């Protein structure tokens, strides 16, 4: 089976193609994870998968969604990571983080609590950045501050610091935020980038932050474990021709800024769209990137069926099929793939203690 | 949805019918669990099920099943599984322990790394206790020595002290271990009990171990928290009809001696048996123990698909319905269940950071 051949990406080898990728859990409290958190991440590591990334997680504090997202702006933050690190590891699966900066999105509310901007007589709140001063619209009304360039140069800098911590706390894998419409994100799309000095206007201006933050953090985070981003590389607003062309172009810039594996994704930066949802709709879109720009990719939404996962590699669409949701309904969901798909000895997907009985 | 309905028990209320009950990791080192038991007993309860019985803990070193086994024989052991109760609990479910003494069937290896005696040569074993000095047989070869006096009111005190430490660690709910062979079992079978004392011979001598067992814990157990047992009831060897009869002439005596219900089961006290393994199986015996003997009971062994279980509640066969390896498969078989049995909103059956998104 295609799925659970290994990986191995500088010195970093996954014991199969399954990731889990990065879903906040909104359970974070001013920043620092706790048993919600530790729980979560070994059983879904236990139940198989090669790779965990670890939920976005802020580089500085106005950089969450939420009051409950993750942190990591702080030595404190990052000791907090340890644990989780530590029993990834011991489950064999590899721990990957995702480092963020909400952008225009930040200041909102968890999901099942409005899922919208927190109001201005709400004092869980905060004053939110972006490229320029533009709202999202619908349920996030509220109008970012316009970052001047000192504000640009700072949060580099917070993703450099970030990519520091997580080293420290013993990451092996990094992957840097820059799609779902934040921060990053809004740098490249014209939709919500209207600056007029050196980071606004051309491709080259609008793609500057993303290829300055890379190469910032490239400066510490380790040559051997594999450096890695999240693009949302179309947005299904009636320009996806061109506005794909433009992004598989940056991700040739990617490669050659070191980059060793896109993730895949939708851009999300306006709600004015016609995203297709549907089974394994990415597939096709992350198999032409992966050809044009010559880059291993991985990509989600809509894999959770093992026969998806599995066609998806065959065809060299995919080098890891990134596999969320099921993992929340089943963090054992790699060993009922591997059931799924006749693995042999199938059971031993999971630690000594289950696969003795269920084989 | 019977399976989804609550269950109260003394001052005790099961936010449904599902329980887990217990099952041996084999991951402990000197008695004392760990993370593996921290993260495997958590996920579990988030998973939704409305009872965790912990896995079989040795009242005593000698009464583990193997080296693996936790243990309770002292406040240090009873210390380590606080974090264990206050997950289970913190996740909306309701802490169990089962206190075990594994008897003649003591001192052997984990199931994957033999499941057989340990030998005399390796320095991993030790002598094992029986009311009688005669072997198991096949697989467990080993005899033990024949229990003296001072052993059984040793032994019975230290179940006390194991269940007065469950209690101070914040249990909610305790099980004493009278089933499938070992140490309590094997008092009461004739096949194992060729004592010629009070403690072997007539039934109530060979009852008298177990019901002063059950009346010595049951001064230190809260008489606000149930009080149950794991008995094998038959033993399929030939001596159904009788054996049956005399079990359930027990279950009446502990339901006299303040047992609040009841896990109905098979005895495994010798090899020489044929058990008709099949889905639901013990549900008939179950049914007849619970009518006859007028306790509440739960059983086990093939009750995992959601169907079956539901089947088994509706039909008053049970009040509650273990549900063991489908929990290793899938520590959230409860949402899985809830699911497929149509359960409304079925998702939140989970906590908030899944449930909003399986919806
Ligand atoms: C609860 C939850 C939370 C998040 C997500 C989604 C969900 C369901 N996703 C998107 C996620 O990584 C993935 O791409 C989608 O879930 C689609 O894959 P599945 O269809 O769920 O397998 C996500 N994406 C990301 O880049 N960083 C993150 O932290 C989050 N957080
Ligand atoms: C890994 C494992 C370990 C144990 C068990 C079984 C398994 C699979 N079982 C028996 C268990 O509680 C249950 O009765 C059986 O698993 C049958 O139910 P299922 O068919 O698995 O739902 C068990 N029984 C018990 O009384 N105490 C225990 O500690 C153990 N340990
Ligand atoms: C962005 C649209 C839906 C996917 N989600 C992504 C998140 C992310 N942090 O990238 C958080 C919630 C949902
Ligand atoms: C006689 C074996 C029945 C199922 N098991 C029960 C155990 C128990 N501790 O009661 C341990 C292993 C297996
Ligand atoms: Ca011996």
Redesign the pocket.
């Known amino acids: 089976s295609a799925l659970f051949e290994p990986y191995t990406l500088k010195d970093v080898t996954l014991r199969n193609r399954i990731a889990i ?5 909104y359970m974070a409290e001013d920043g620092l994870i706790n048993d919600w958190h530790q729980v979560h991440y070994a059983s879904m590591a236990r139940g198989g998968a090669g790779l965990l990334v670890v ?2 997680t802020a580089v500085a504090p106005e950089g969450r969604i939420t009051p409950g997202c993750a942190g990591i702006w702080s030595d404190a933050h990052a000791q907090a990571f340890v644990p989780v690190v530590q029993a990834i590891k011991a489950a064999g699966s590899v721990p990957g983080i ?1 480092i ?1 900066h909400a952008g225009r999105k930040a200041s909102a509310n968890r ?1 099942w609590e409005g899922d919208d901007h927190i109001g201005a007589d709400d004092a869980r709140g905060w004053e939110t950045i972006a490229p320029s001063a533009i709202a999202f619209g619908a349920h996030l009304p509220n109008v970012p501050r316009a970052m001047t360039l000192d504000d640009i140069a700072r949060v580099k800098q917070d993703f450099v610091d970030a990519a520091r911590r997580a080293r420290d706390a013993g990451f092996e894998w990094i ?1 840097l ?1 820059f ?2 419409g934040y921060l990053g994100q809004s740098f490249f799309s014209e939709h919500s980038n209207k600056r007029t000095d050196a980071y606004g206007g051309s491709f080259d201006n609008r793609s500057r932050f993303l290829l300055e933050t890379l190469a910032a953090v490239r400066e510490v985070w380790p040559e051997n474990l594999p450096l890695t981003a ?1 693009f949302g590389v179309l947005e299904y607003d009636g320009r996806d021709e061109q506005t794909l062309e433009e992004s598989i172009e940056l991700a040739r810039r990617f490669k050659a800024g070191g980059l060793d594996l896109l ?1 895949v ?1 939708v851009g999300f930066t306006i709600p004015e769209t016609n995203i297709p949802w549907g089974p394994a709709f990415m597939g096709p879109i992350a198999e032409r990137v992966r050809r044009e720009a010559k880059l291993p990719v991985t990509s ?5 069926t093992p026969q998806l996962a599995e066609a998806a590699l065959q065809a060299n669409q995919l080098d890891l099929v ?7 309904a089943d963090p054992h969901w790699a060993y009922f793939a591997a059931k799924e798909l006749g693995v042999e000895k199938a059971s031993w997907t999971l630690p000594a203690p289950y696969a003795h009985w269920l084989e």
Chains 1, 2 share one sequence.
């Open positions: 990728p990065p879903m906040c859990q939920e976005a995702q963020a999901p992957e935020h799609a779902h999240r993730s994704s989600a939404w809509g894999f959770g990134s596999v969320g949701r099921a993992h929340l």
